[PDB]
């Protein structure tokens, strides 16, 4: 009696991802390798964002990740910024950027 998530070495629920594949009308049949594979990719991507966001939280000397930290983690990583270029982060803010020609001296 073991869940498929531990049998695959993941923290994300493989059984649920299998259920959402069936009830989402994506196709009539779902092999068991698909929810495991998809659950692995969702956990990996989640970890990559949480890592960079945590570093942003420490660099502002905070211990808890707020949306601002997630925004700084995404808009500063090139590939994450490409994946979510058409996404708006609530309570995210903008990256500090002043065009050089506006500066004095």
């Amino acid at each position: 009696a073991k869940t498929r998530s531990s049998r695959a070495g993941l923290q994300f629920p493989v059984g649920r991802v299998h259920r959402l594949l069936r009830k989402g009308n994506y196709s009539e049949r779902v092999g068991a390798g698909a929810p495991v594979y998809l659950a692995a990719v969702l956990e990996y991507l989640t970890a990559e964002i949480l890592e960079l966001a945590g570093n942003a939280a420490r660099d502002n000397k905070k211990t808890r990740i707020i949306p601002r930290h997630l925004q700084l983690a995404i808009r500063n990583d090139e590939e994450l910024n490409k994946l979510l270029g058409r996404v708006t982060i609530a309570q995210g803010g903008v990256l500090p950027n002043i065009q050089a020609v506006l500066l004095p001296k």
């Binding site: 996404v87 708006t88 982060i89 609530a90 803010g93 950027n97 065009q99 506006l102």
Partner: protein, 82 residues
């Protein structure tokens, strides 16, 4: 005092948005142009959200209706469910 609702977006508020966008100098005619753009945007989104609300046979526009409406415009939004 009587004035339109589109004027509630006050000139210091539009100025604050431009400052977050890195703008240094703002011509006067911008403030009316910005109010027109802000209205066109809100009109397109709410029309789609309301269309979702009617189809659910509801009378309360929900946060998911607006999220699905923004998602339809290509303006995806994270952090309000779904």
């Amino acid at each position: 005092v009587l004035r339109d609702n589109i004027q509630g977006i006050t000139k210091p508020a539009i100025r604050r948005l431009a400052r977050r966008g890195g703008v240094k100098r703002i011509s006067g005619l911008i403030y009316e142009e910005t109010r027109g753009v802000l209205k066109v945007f809100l009109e397109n989104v709410i029309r789609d959200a309301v269309t979702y609300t009617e189809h659910a046979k509801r009378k309360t526009v929900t946060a998911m209706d607006v999220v699905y409406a923004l998602k339809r415009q290509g303006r995806t939004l994270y952090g309000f469910g779904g």
